[PDB]
Amino acid sequence: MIKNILGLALGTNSIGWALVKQDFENKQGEILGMGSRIIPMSQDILGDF
């Protein structure tokens, strides 16, 4: 009935993390946490790999 959901988006050097507490059946719910973790490296590596 109430569900904790963790959405993860994975990039070349980025992790997008979001955590929500959804109750879809009643059109309710709210977000709990959001963030993006970045691993720095030059775009030379991005164009090279």
Added chain:
DNA sequence: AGACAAAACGACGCGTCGTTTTGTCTCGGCTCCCCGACATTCTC
């Protein structure tokens, strides 16, 4: 090729050593104490 490290450019721009030159409160009235020197007399 990328993106960081720093040299280069700018007119601009202000600091900096070594010396020279400049600027720096003013006058009025009195009173009463002390001392110094130089003349005379007098004592020793």
